[PDB]
Amino acid sequence: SGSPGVEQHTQAFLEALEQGGGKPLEQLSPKDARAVLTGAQASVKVDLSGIEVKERTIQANGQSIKLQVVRPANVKGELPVFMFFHGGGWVLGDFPTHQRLIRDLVVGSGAVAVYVDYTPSPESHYPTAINQAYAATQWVAEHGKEIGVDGKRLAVAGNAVGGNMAAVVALKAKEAGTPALRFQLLLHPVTDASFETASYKQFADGHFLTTGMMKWFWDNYTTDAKAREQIYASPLRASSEQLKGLPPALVQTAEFDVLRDEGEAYARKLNAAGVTVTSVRYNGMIHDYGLLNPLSQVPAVKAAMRQAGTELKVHLQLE
Amino acid sequence: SGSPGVEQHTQAFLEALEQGGGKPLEQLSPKDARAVLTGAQASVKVDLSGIEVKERTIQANGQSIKLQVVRPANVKGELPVFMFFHGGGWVLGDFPTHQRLIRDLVVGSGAVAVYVDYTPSPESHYPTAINQAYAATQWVAEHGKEIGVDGKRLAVAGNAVGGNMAAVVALKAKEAGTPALRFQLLLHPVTDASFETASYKQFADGHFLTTGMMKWFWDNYTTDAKAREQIYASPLRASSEQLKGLPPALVQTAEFDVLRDEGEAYARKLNAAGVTVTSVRYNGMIHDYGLLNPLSQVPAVKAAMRQAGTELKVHLQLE
Numbered sequence: 001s002g003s004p005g006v007e008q009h010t011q012a013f014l015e016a017l018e019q020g021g022g023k024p025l026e027q028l029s030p031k032d033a034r035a036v037l038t039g040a041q042a043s044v045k046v047d048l049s050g051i052e053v054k055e056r057t058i059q060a061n062g063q064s065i066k067l068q069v070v071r072p073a074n075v076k077g078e079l080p081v082f083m084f085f086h087g088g089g090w091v092l093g094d095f096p097t098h099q100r101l102i103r104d105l106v107v108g109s110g111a112v113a114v115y116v117d118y119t120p121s122p123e124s125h126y127p128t129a130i131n132q133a134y135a136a137t138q139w140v141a142e143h144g145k146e147i148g149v150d151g152k153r154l155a156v157a158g159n160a161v162g163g164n165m166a167a168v169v170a171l172k173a174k175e176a177g178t179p180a181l182r183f184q185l186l187l188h189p190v191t192d193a194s195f196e197t198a199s200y201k202q203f204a205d206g207h208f209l210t211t212g213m214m215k216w217f218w219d220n221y222t223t224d225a226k227a228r229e230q231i232y233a234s235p236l237r238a239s240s241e242q243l244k245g246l247p248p249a250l251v252q253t254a255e256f257d258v259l260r261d262e263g264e265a266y267a268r269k270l271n272a273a274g275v276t277v278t279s280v281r282y283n284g285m286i287h288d289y290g291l292l293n294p295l296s297q298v299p300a301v302k303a304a305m306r307q308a309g310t311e312l313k314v315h316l317q318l319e
Numbered sequence: 320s321g322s323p324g325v326e327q328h329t330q331a332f333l334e335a336l337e338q339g340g341g342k343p344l345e346q347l348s349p350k351d352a353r354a355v356l357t358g359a360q361a362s363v364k365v366d367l368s369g370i371e372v373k374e375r376t377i378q379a380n381g382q383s384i385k386l387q388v389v390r391p392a393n394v395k396g397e398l399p400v401f402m403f404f405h406g407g408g409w410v411l412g413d414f415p416t417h418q419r420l421i422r423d424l425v426v427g428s429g430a431v432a433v434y435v436d437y438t439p440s441p442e443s444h445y446p447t448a449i450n451q452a453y454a455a456t457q458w459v460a461e462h463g464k465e466i467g468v469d470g471k472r473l474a475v476a477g478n479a480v481g482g483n484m485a486a487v488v489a490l491k492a493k494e495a496g497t498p499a500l501r502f503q504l505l506l507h508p509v510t511d512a513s514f515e516t517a518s519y520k521q522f523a524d525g526h527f528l529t530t531g532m533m534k535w536f537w538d539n540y541t542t543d544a545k546a547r548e549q550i551y552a553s554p555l556r557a558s559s560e561q562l563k564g565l566p567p568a569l570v571q572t573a574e575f576d577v578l579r580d581e582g583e584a585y586a587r588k589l590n591a592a593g594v595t596v597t598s599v600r601y602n603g604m605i606h607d608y609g610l611l612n613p614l615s616q617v618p619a620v621k622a623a624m625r626q627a628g629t630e631l632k633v634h635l636q637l638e
């Protein structure tokens with residue numbers, strides 16, 4: 001478990017995982033793997049106060065798409081808004097597993113989150129979910145009044161493959177010429193369908209997210225090699241010209257995460273393309289510390305969450 | 320100038336420095352070198368609003384020590400407080416060169432800064448300044464009412480050698496058993512009188528702070544090898560037992576800073592000793608981005624400053 005330099009509570013978490021192992025996640029059926037995350041997130045008392053949650057089903061992408069709209073409690077008027085794309089490696093995850101993370105971003109930013117219930121993998125494959133994600137984002141931009149938001153002040157946010165999804169939705173919005181986006185919040189994003197970065201090599205196991213999981217996640221998403229080479233799957237492969245004009249980004253990475261290097265590399269490519277980027281590595285931390293309910297009271301995690309909420313707020317102001 | 324991955328405005332700054340060079344800083348007299356920083360900081364329009372500045376001379380350390388007390392404007396009552404220790408490699412720096420940085424921390428935190436006017440080097444040598452710094456911190460703890468602060472809610476903060484000073488004052492407070500400190504804010508701290516870390520090797524020149532400057536700074540501070548080995552000069556040399564019980568820390572480092580590795584290493588040692596630490600590397604950034612007035616409008620720099628102010632605020636609340 002862990003490494004020299006892992007933050008103390010995080011290291012204890014890793015050791016607890018190592019104890020009483022269980023089968024590797026990637027050896028489970030999608031149903032059983034989904035239940036592992038559900039059970040783990042439900043195992044910890046967490047503050048979910050300060051929010052008003054309501055479901056809305058929309059017609060877009062030529063289908064019905066379910067949204068969970070999460071609004072700061074006791075606030076009147078149209079509020080700015082961020083789309084929220086959940087992580088879980090495409091196979092896992094949903095709204096309640098991610099509700100604490102979403103709640104923290106909403107309460108900290110004062111903005112409304114719109115969770116999009118994209119179709120999981122392998123039930124669907126690329127590009128089904130990203131097309132749903134984009135469709136919902138366009139819908140919010142043009143129909144925001146219906147759910148109490150100002151669709152002209154619109155960001156995208158997500159963790160892990162949700163960070164992939166947020167980045168790709170920003171690219172799709174550029175491709176489509178609409179909608180205008182204020183900001184992209186990328187928390188430990190997946191950015192490349194390749195597994196040879198220094199961080200992938202160093203943290204292959206023992207640090208929660210493993211290389212084995214990442215390959216399984218990608219395989220469930222799509223085994224089409226040409227699909228994986230597209231910028232809408234692996235945005236790290238985009239040229240400077242393709243990245244030009246994307247909205248300002250905050251990218252948080254974790255020191256002990258296989259995805260650390262590709263996230264920081266994507267931030268560099270955005271910067272080289274003239275996009276405004278803040279790229280921050282949280283040392284001592286593991287992958288997706290912001291999702292994990294058992295880590296939500298770690299002081300560094302709280303600091304990272306204060307930052308994520310504040311930066312959403314900064315970019316969602318009037319004028 | 321610079322490297323692949325340097326944030327765009329920062330890279331332009333580095334290129335401007337390279338153009339129209341001038342003599343290396345470390346070849347100048349202390350007087351002339353001091354004027355270089357003064358002139359550069361004065362070259363940029365910056366917001367200094369929202370603060371009330373007043374000088375106070377105190378009797379401590381068996382001498383007179385000048386303080387600049389920087390209070391949020393239009394606020395009544397006793398406020399919590401952080402000591403502020405300026406950087407400049409011991410040779411350079413003062414209050415006005417650092418006033419924008421201090422102002423940003425005050426306005427963002429809502430807490431009062433107490434700048435300590437320690438004796439520069441080589442006019443004095445180790446341990447004169449750190450003894451003054453500690454003496455002033457103890458004074459504020461016990462006499463805070465006189466300058467409108469709650470001395471029981473007291474943090475230490477500083478940039479570069481000021482980060483060294485803040486860390487060392489926390490160690491001296493532990494050694495003395497007083498005063499109680501809420502928090503240490505270390506912005507790109509100097510932590511070791513050695514020059515062989517990977518970051519020292521990689522960024523030896525071309526990134527504002529050079530290895531040559533750092534060696535000159537240390538030489539002016541003290542050439543006593545035994546002094547440099549003391550934990551009050553090089554706190555990285557402290558054992559876990561020596562670090563045990565120190566106050567919670569936020570350490571910000573910069574990706575392209577010779578001091579990056581020793582700062583992150585000190586954060587690791589604090590964590591190993593059970594101290595609460597948040598260690599954050601701002602990618603794309605150079606050394607002491609928070610001091611430099613020409614960089615104060617870079618978005619990543621603004622985000623880092625919002626974080627520094629917020630974390631001071633978090634740790635200076637009642638109860």
Ligand SMILES: CC(=O)O[C@H](C(=O)O)c1ccccc1Cl
Nearest residue numbers: 017025036037040041208292294
């Ligand atoms: C990677 C794994 O095996 O799942 C963990 C477990 O409960 O074992 C786990 C632990 C805490 C939070 C989430 C998850 Cl998913």
Ligand SMILES: CC(=O)O[C@H](C(=O)O)c1ccccc1Cl
Nearest residue numbers: 037087088089092160161209288
């Ligand atoms: C790459 C991805 O999306 O990461 C997931 C995440 O942490 O969100 C994840 C990774 C490992 C175990 C559980 C979960 Cl849920």
Ligand SMILES: CC(=O)O[C@H](C(=O)O)c1ccccc1Cl
Nearest residue numbers: 297298299302303567595633634
């Ligand atoms: C778990 C947690 O609350 O850590 C806090 C935070 O960073 O929010 C914190 C808040 C106030 C004082 C100390 C500390 Cl450590």
Ligand SMILES: CC(=O)O[C@H](C(=O)O)c1ccccc1Cl
Nearest residue numbers: 336344355356359360527611613
């Ligand atoms: C390191 C050096 O030579 O000083 C710089 C210069 O003006 O050349 C400089 C530039 C901007 C801000 C401060 C300073 Cl000190």
Ligand SMILES: CC(=O)O[C@H](C(=O)O)c1ccccc1Cl
Nearest residue numbers: 356406407408411479480528607
């Ligand atoms: C090590 C130190 O204290 O760094 C100074 C700082 O950036 O504060 C500094 C470094 C290079 C040039 C000017 C100045 Cl002022």
Ligand SMILES: CC(=O)O[C@H](C(=O)O)c1ccccc1Cl
Nearest residue numbers: 248276314315616617618621622
């Ligand atoms: C120079 C600067 O203000 O950048 C800002 C910041 O991060 O504070 C900012 C604020 C609102 C919207 C965009 C941007 Cl980029």
